[PDB]
Design a protein around this ligand. Structure first.
Ligand code: HDD
Ligand code: HDD
Lengths: 726, 726
């Protein structure tokens, strides 16, 4: 019942490209990768090799194949305590998934600042460019269950737990710089509207349904984040290729007590890249685990996800200086007005050992701040502070959630709190209260100060009556949506139009579509007309006369809002499909593989069956997957080397592979006789931008392909795709 | 007052076909559809129209848009009890999902027997053909979470709660007649192996991964249910078009105390029908809720799902008369040996009101039997009896899950059990123990009897030592897989071959593929060779020499094991895509639509945009969805009426629609000029079986199409589709 004699059951404990080895728990794959937090989990990591199988009580089991019965065809006996322990534990494996962001993928890593920020913050983790702070990061979707798909259109979560020497700091952000709503009190209304509808629990992972567009049409504050969700930001290529944002204005507090307003940013060093909608959708079926898998494999390959932490900083005296309210989380701060200052780099360099223990049980909460940080009055942030503590009581079984290993501080924690379900800490303090004389008052309060001080809130002035009232300054809904729209490239605009058109086409009640289109007419008439057309709606004269909203502080556009306007391509960690034939020209493959390796681009070798093919020079080529098993959806570009092309010329799946990649705007490269495939995707003999062709795969051929891959997708091809049946 | 003044926000309370109206809670959609259980839920149904919005304590809310703060831009106050109640309930909405069958869709209905079964069972619900028993049924997948996709390849659950006059009877079955393993002690090993792998939590909703095939390769008892899952059984068209089975041998006990062994069956009156793999997988992406949705809409349309309950019955004296053990749940009872006797009909005729409250909280458990039934020593069933009670303690929060309204018996329940979390029932009995004199010993035990008696177990003889030992009678693994294989049509066999080839191709460790192939070589060499070819694996002479397993009691096949060998087509409730153009020939549409209506087949009118198109004669045609919005995956056939075909002849989506429908073997009909599309799918001028074509949609056109639909798919097309790129 055992391992194969060759040791091929066990993956190498070395960095390896996606698909080369089976994936494995982080500590077995990369045992020499360490940080303070990873090491501190060693008390609870449990091995297996050479150990006897036991009950949870430590009793060795002799027969784990059978229940205890009265004769071998008889009834099962109640005294079989081994069976009931095993079954009882199985029967209770599940815990409540998170209310929102139930679907997510996580990894370990570390953070360090570029330079001390003690001028603006006394936060210890930002005080020294050579103090490393471990992190645990969870990326997520928002609406779907823990078993929903990755590549849905949705906001993405981006939560980072920093295990600092002065306490845990959780920066709990999303991949867009705003949220749908203004006050936490409306959170259950918004989330109930986007979630599956309550009578039938449909649809999963989709805002494309009546209730969501109902709420949107009636709550125009939502339109800004909806524009982002309908843009390609809603369907990222990978969690490594999206931005992160804290959304709210927080405060930094320095040693001298000065407060500075701050918004948080994460910049992806692998660049910004998203899928296209037909590709993302079809991908939730071909591989609902695509982003989870891609993150885990990138880490196993050494393509560590890296992010730059950046701050937008606004002096206190500048609170009222924009034409929007800094505390309104439906408003972004344009980088043209306030630049992002580089703060530090985060590297994710190890996967967890057990998803449930480390990922599913992790609890992030934006109230977990540290000295040198503070809140503001943002009314959405204010209510979040209540929820993230409260929800852990059911999700994680009670108030000792900070004792679940993933959640534990690596710095000291001591206080007079006691008991609770599943209490691990055994307190020896004679006192469980303070003030106490019986333990000389320990543990003791600590005055605030420059470093290692107690937490004291910034003494912000509060003046007003007790009111349930929206600030009048929040009552503007169109100008940020319009600034975002004007900042996208024409093809990004087209995809926004297509997203609204596609979603609203799935709204059954036509008046809801109409009301949404009327809201679009208040943002931008070209957008509104283009959506209306697709819905067979005609704008009224009044609608055509709606005055567009004002510019944002004089800005006609801000290109930092676009995924693609300013190139920031990085091909390392991307992947190519190489479509094999039964007689590959080995000279082509040599050159292809060598150029890709030089840029850290991975390859997957595909064929019409599994096993091996032999190349022209006798090289045996192992096959990663079939053309159907690993579709073009899962790769960044497609290369077809020369060889016996007749072998694959009339294979439907091979031809379709190229048609799907073509439709989805990916680079394709055809060497020698592989150019016969140009007829399948209707390329003229002259060739075209985005299809690489030559007599063979040489220096030039690969350089070309790699240049296209750095530009991500071939946007100039878009007019040519609506005619192809794919 | 936000409803549209035309009342179009509210769906009509009358049966309407899929897509015609928004879906609704069953009691608002079909208020006159009643049964005793639905009626008994009235005490907890909560309405809404005309009511003031309140806290849960009944306090009217004035402003549900804002938190209470100090100043309208000030901090949120802890005294906002309205905010905290509303966020608290939200923060705790989730409960743990089911350990297995997390993904399920459910409906209300009723059951009635055809005639009294008093001669063979004293079960009250089967005693009288005029006794109607309310039921609640949940259908499910097995592996994936509650938010996973419906049309995965997996076993399906089919669980029926009968609310009988003598107690709840739960018939908790699946859509295949056996299970993967023999003894309940291995259920967590099997389930852990099929579920997402523990390091990374991948893959969702798929057995296509290493650990599953590792376990199967090492436990040949699994192979029979694996054959079922690899066939088109693993991807049903609808919950209305699969079979249901209790799997285990149970007992019926009559008034005279005679036991008869029984296996339970559900026959779908809508026939057996499945998807094909490429369609199924793509549909998990285009509509992960397809089966849930199809069930709900069939019920709203009046196409109620109906099933006939049947029994395979075996006298006690025949226990040992088969080549396999009756208590072995890896073995089926071939209907050629033991016919299914028709017992009664179940009709599902109303959707729930609230999915969480009725579907998510429902608790089914096969130990919930009633006098007139009993168990056997089947060692899988024996362990199930422990699990389904235990698991509710966490899932539903304690031992009072029977007081959750969907779970309550409709008949009396009284006992001495008290307290527990969530206790609803307020006991007034002076006594909470028996025997007692202080309440005259009430409630009292009831002797067994012909009717309305207490439950007494059949006094089966037990003789043996206390052993953890598998019966040697269970040690045969191959002959049932082989009988199943030999019973399939050739196209079914090919689909089995492709299901194994596709799954093993996702298994990263090659030695596991090889070991599975070797197991197949023990079942049937043709199967094993065909899967080996697809994997690039060469059978050894030893493997080519393995002698096949014996016939099952002289059977070389049983056609009842095939989905399609014996025609059982039913078109009612199926759906057709109609591809419109901007000037449709109205006479064609009249003929098509009326022909479909007469046979209970639905239509969806599709185009390149939403809104309307106008026919030749000026009739205005409402568009249901776009070609891309409602892909051919979601229909059973496609009809292209004549008109201005030039409108759509160059539309990539229109073309691809037909290519996808064609690849997946679906009937396609083309009228007048729509026949120019013949070139898109490569049909010969003189046409082919499975393509209907004529000058118009008059005469025999619609009959020919409906005939194809009654046969489900165009299996003869299979050799044609391999070369088409779609
Ligand atoms: C007042 C309610 C509330 C509102 C207004 C917000 N959140 Fe939240 N959030 C929760 C209440 C909550 C929560 C219900 O507490 C969750 C799910 C359950 C839990 O553990 O946290 C959560 C989870 C959650 C996660 C997933 C953390 C993880 O991976 O485990 C992220 C990334 C965010 N939130 C980010 C945001 C952003 C960017 C918001 C707007 C700027 C926001 N939340 C507003
Ligand atoms: C000893 C463990 C055990 C084993 C051997 C089985 N089950 Fe089971 N089953 C459970 C333990 C369990 C459970 C974990 O207790 C579940 C999930 C949560 C629940 O309430 O019951 C369940 C759920 C469950 C459901 C879903 C009910 C619903 O819709 O809520 C169905 C249809 C079945 N089972 C059917 C089967 C079949 C056909 C089996 C093999 C013949 C089988 N079970 C063996």
């Amino acid at each position: 019942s055992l391992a194969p004699e060759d040791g091929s059951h066990r993956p190498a404990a070395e960095p390896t490209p996606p698909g080369a080895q089976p994936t494995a728990p982080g500590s077995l794959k990369a045992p020499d990768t360490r940080n303070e937090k990873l090491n501190s989990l060693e008390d609870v990591r449990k091995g297996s090799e050479n150990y006897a199988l036991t009950t949870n009580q430590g009793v060795r089991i002799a027969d784990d194949q059978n229940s205890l019965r009265a004769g071998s065809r008889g009834p099962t006996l109640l005294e079989d305590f081994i069976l009931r322990e095993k079954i009882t534990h199985f029967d209770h494996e599940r815990i409540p998934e998170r209310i929102v962001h139930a679907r997510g993928s996580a990894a370990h890593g570390y953070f360090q600042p570029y330079k001390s920020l003690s001028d603006i913050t006394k936060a210890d983790f930002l005080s020294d460019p050579n103090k490393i702070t471990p992190v645990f990061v969870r990326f997520s979707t928002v609406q779907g269950g823990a078993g929903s798909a990755d590549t849905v259109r949705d906001i993405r979560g981006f939560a980072t737990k920093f295990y600092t020497e002065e306490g845990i700091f959780d920066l709990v952000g999303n991949n867009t710089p705003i949220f749908f709503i203004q006050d936490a009190h409306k959170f259950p209304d918004f989330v109930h509207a986007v979630k599956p509808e309550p009578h039938w629990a449909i649809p999963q992972g989709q805002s494309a349904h009546d209730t969501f567009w109902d709420y949107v049409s009636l709550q125009p504050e939502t339109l800004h984040n909806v524009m982002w969700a309908m843009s390609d930001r809603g369907i990222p290529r990978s969690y490594r290729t999206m931005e992160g944002f804290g959304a709210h204005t927080f405060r930094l507090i320095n040693a001298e007590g000065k407060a500075t307003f701050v918004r948080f940013h994460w910049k992806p060093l692998a660049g910004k890249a998203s899928l296209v909608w037909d590709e993302a959708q079809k991908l939730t079926g071909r591989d609902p685990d695509f982003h989870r898998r891609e993150l885990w494999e990138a880490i196993e390959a050494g393509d560590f996800p890296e992010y730059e932490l950046g701050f937008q900083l606004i002096p206190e005296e500048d609170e009222f200086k924009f034409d929007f309210d800094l505390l309104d989380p439906t408003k972004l701060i344009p980088e043209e007005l306030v630049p992002v200052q580089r703060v530090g780099k985060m590297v994710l360099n190890r996967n967890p050992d057990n998803f449930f223990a480390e990922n599913e049980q992790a609890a992030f909460h934006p109230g977990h701040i540290v000295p040198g940080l503070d809140f503001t009055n943002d009314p959405l942030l204010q209510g979040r502070l209540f929820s993230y503590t409260d929800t852990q009581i059911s999700r994680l079984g009670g108030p000792n959630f900070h004792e679940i290993p993933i959640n534990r501080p690596t710095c000291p924690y001591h206080n007079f709190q006691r008991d609770g379900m599943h209490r691990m800490g055994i307190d020896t303090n004679p006192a469980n209260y303070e003030p106490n004389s019986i333990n000389d008052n320990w543990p003791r309060e600590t005055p605030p100060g420059p470093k290692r001080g107690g937490f004291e809130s910034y003494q912000e002035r509060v003046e007003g009556n007790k009111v349930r009232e929206r600030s009048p300054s929040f009552g503007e809904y169109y100008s940020h949506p319009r600034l975002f729209w004007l900042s996208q490239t024409p093809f990004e605009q087209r995809h926004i139009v297509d997203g609204f058109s596609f979603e609203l086409s799935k709204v059954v009640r036509p008046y809801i579509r109409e009301r949404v289109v009327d809201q679009l007419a208040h943002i931008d008439l070209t957008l509104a007309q283009a959506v209306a057309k697709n819905l067979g709606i005609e704008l009224t004269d009044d609608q055509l006369n709606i005055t567009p909203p004002p510019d944002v502080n004089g800005l006609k556009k801000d290109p930092s809002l676009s995924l693609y306007a300013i190139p920031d391509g990085d091909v390392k960690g991307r992947v190519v499909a190489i479509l094999l034939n039964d007689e590959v020209r080995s000279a082509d493959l040599l050159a292809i593989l060598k150029a890709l390796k030089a840029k850290g681009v991975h390859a997957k070798l595909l064929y019409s069956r599994m096993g091996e093919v032999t190349a022209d020079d006798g090289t045996v080529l192992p096959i990663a997957a079939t053309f159907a098993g690993a579709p073009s959806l899962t790769v960044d570009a497609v290369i077809v080397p020369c060889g016996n092309i007749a072998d694959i010329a009339d294979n439907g799946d091979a031809n379709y592979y190229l048609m799907e990649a073509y439709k989805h705007l990916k680079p394709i490269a055809l060497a020698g006789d592989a150019r016969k495939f140009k007829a399948t995707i209707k390329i003229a003999d002259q060739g075209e931008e985005g299809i690489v062709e030559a007599d063979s795969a040489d220096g030039s051929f690969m350089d070309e392909l790699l240049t296209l891959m750095a530009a991500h997708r071939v946007w100039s091809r878009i007019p040519k795709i609506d005619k192809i049946p794919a």
